[model samples]
Target: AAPKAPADGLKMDKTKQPVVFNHSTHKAVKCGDCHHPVNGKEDLQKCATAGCHDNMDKKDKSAKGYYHAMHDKGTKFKSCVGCHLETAGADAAKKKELTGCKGSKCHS
Candidate 1:
């Protein structure tokens, strides 16, 4: 069966619904992929909890907030769509069923 999104997911923006971070489907990825750490070791902690990547600080140009933590451009250490696009080429990109940054794909 197709993997479903988590009941509650991290919000992409105030206007749109939360983007699902499918834990089950993402199990194939390495821990450090999302739990990115600047000090070399993976940051195996929460993104928006306590003093972590919480508060959505715009001062962090490179995405110091949880949103940037996973939605930043491909240049950053981590990103959802960024990595997917990175892992594929123009040929493969044309065959994706799960395309769209808004509705009809992962957003609501």
Candidate 2:
């Protein structure tokens, strides 16, 4: 059977959503940082919760906006490796540990 489309008519374009997330920069954060483990795997978790994302003074329209700033063309946002790896130099070692976020190592 064919998959049903969303009732809202909002379609996601996977091709345009190829932004990379760096993990090295967020080294201080824990595993439950951006996501929550559901059954063992990570799931989308809210960042703002009084002391989290909402605490930031900057305007964050939605969670996607925050992610866009870091994942997309925003120069102010840090690259993927900036958060995942221990340091920029540690990227080489990070590449072997696929458990971290994308672009946390060497990526174009």
Best by lDDT: 1
Please report how far candidate 2 places residue 13 from its true position, in Å: 6.5
38-104: candidate 1 lDDT, tens digit per residue: 5786665556666666756544645556556555565466466566665544754432624455552
- TM agreement with the true structure for every prediction: 0.58, 0.25
- Local accuracy by lDDT, each model: 0.57, 0.39
Best by TM-score: 1
Weakest lDDT window of 10 consecutive positions for candidate 1:
91-100
**In candidate 1, which residue ranges exceed 4 Å CA deviation?**
1-16, 38-41, 57-60, 74-76, 91-99
